[PDB]
Design a protein around this motif. Structure first.
Motif, PDB file in Angstrom:
ATOM      1  N   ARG A 111      -0.402  -5.488  -6.358  1.00  0.00           N
ATOM      2  CA  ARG A 111       0.952  -4.988  -6.497  1.00  0.00           C
ATOM      3  C   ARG A 111       0.934  -3.798  -7.441  1.00  0.00           C
ATOM      4  N   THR A 112      -0.172  -3.678  -8.171  1.00  0.00           N
ATOM      5  CA  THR A 112      -0.344  -2.593  -9.120  1.00  0.00           C
ATOM      6  C   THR A 112      -0.894  -1.355  -8.422  1.00  0.00           C
ATOM      7  N   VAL A 113      -1.930  -1.554  -7.612  1.00  0.00           N
ATOM      8  CA  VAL A 113      -2.547  -0.446  -6.893  1.00  0.00           C
ATOM      9  C   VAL A 113      -1.582   0.141  -5.869  1.00  0.00           C
ATOM     10  N   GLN A 114      -0.912  -0.724  -5.114  1.00  0.00           N
ATOM     11  CA  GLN A 114       0.034  -0.255  -4.106  1.00  0.00           C
ATOM     12  C   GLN A 114       0.994   0.769  -4.704  1.00  0.00           C
ATOM     13  N   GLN A 115       1.134   0.744  -6.026  1.00  0.00           N
ATOM     14  CA  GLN A 115       2.025   1.678  -6.707  1.00  0.00           C
ATOM     15  C   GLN A 115       1.319   3.010  -6.941  1.00  0.00           C
ATOM     16  N   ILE A 116       0.087   3.102  -6.454  1.00  0.00           N
ATOM     17  CA  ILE A 116      -0.706   4.315  -6.602  1.00  0.00           C
ATOM     18  C   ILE A 116      -0.091   5.462  -5.807  1.00  0.00           C
ATOM     19  N   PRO A 117       0.093   6.608  -6.415  1.00  0.00           N
ATOM     20  CA  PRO A 117       0.663   7.783  -5.706  1.00  0.00           C
ATOM     21  C   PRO A 117      -0.333   8.335  -4.693  1.00  0.00           C
ATOM     22  N   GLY A 118       0.122   8.518  -3.464  1.00  0.00           N
ATOM     23  CA  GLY A 118      -0.747   9.025  -2.411  1.00  0.00           C
ATOM     24  C   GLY A 118      -0.829   8.028  -1.259  1.00  0.00           C
ATOM     25  N   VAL A 119      -1.137   6.772  -1.581  1.00  0.00           N
ATOM     26  CA  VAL A 119      -1.231   5.741  -0.549  1.00  0.00           C
ATOM     27  C   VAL A 119       0.004   5.773   0.340  1.00  0.00           C
ATOM     28  N   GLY A 120       1.172   5.778  -0.291  1.00  0.00           N
ATOM     29  CA  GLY A 120       2.429   5.801   0.443  1.00  0.00           C
ATOM     30  C   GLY A 120       2.887   4.389   0.772  1.00  0.00           C
ATOM     31  N   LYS A 121       3.543   3.742  -0.186  1.00  0.00           N
ATOM     32  CA  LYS A 121       4.029   2.390   0.039  1.00  0.00           C
ATOM     33  C   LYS A 121       4.637   2.309   1.433  1.00  0.00           C
ATOM     34  N   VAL A 122       4.979   3.476   1.968  1.00  0.00           N
ATOM     35  CA  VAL A 122       5.554   3.572   3.301  1.00  0.00           C
ATOM     36  C   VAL A 122       4.502   3.236   4.347  1.00  0.00           C
ATOM     37  N   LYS A 123       3.312   3.786   4.156  1.00  0.00           N
ATOM     38  CA  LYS A 123       2.212   3.556   5.078  1.00  0.00           C
ATOM     39  C   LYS A 123       1.465   2.277   4.710  1.00  0.00           C
ATOM     40  N   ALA A 124       1.643   1.828   3.471  1.00  0.00           N
ATOM     41  CA  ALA A 124       0.980   0.615   3.005  1.00  0.00           C
ATOM     42  C   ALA A 124       0.881  -0.407   4.134  1.00  0.00           C
ATOM     43  N   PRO A 125       1.998  -0.800   4.688  1.00  0.00           N
ATOM     44  CA  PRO A 125       2.035  -1.791   5.801  1.00  0.00           C
ATOM     45  C   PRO A 125       1.499  -1.204   7.102  1.00  0.00           C
ATOM     46  N   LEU A 126       1.655   0.106   7.256  1.00  0.00           N
ATOM     47  CA  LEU A 126       1.180   0.788   8.454  1.00  0.00           C
ATOM     48  C   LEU A 126      -0.335   0.833   8.467  1.00  0.00           C
ATOM     49  N   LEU A 127      -0.882   1.417   7.415  1.00  0.00           N
ATOM     50  CA  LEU A 127      -2.318   1.551   7.276  1.00  0.00           C
ATOM     51  C   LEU A 127      -2.965   0.187   7.078  1.00  0.00           C
ATOM     52  N   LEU A 128      -2.173  -0.776   6.620  1.00  0.00           N
ATOM     53  CA  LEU A 128      -2.679  -2.125   6.402  1.00  0.00           C
ATOM     54  C   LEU A 128      -3.005  -2.780   7.738  1.00  0.00           C
TER      55      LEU A 128
END
Length: 61
Positions: free
Chosen positions: A7-24
């Motif tokens: 939950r800490t890394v997901q807050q990393i700038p660049g990943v895109g919490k938006v794509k988080a689930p997409l790229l996941l």
């Protein structure tokens, strides 16, 4: 109780919490997702980005 590193890394700038689930969908979770091969994360959002998220979790601050 549970590890926030995810939950800490997901807050990393660049990943895109938006794509988080997409790229996941293609990767385990923001845990491993954020550690996905550069070639992927790069050709996925940014060469520098994929390069940041890779070194980001490399050094826990």
């Amino acid at each position: 109780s549970e590890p926030s590193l995810l939950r800490t890394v997901q807050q990393i700038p660049g990943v895109g919490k938006v794509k988080a689930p997409l790229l996941l969908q293609k990767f385990p979770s923001i845990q491993q997702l954020s550690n996905a091969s550069i070639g992927e994360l790069e050709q996925v959002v940014g060469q520098a980005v994929a390069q940041q998220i890779h070194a980001f979790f490399t050094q826990p601050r």
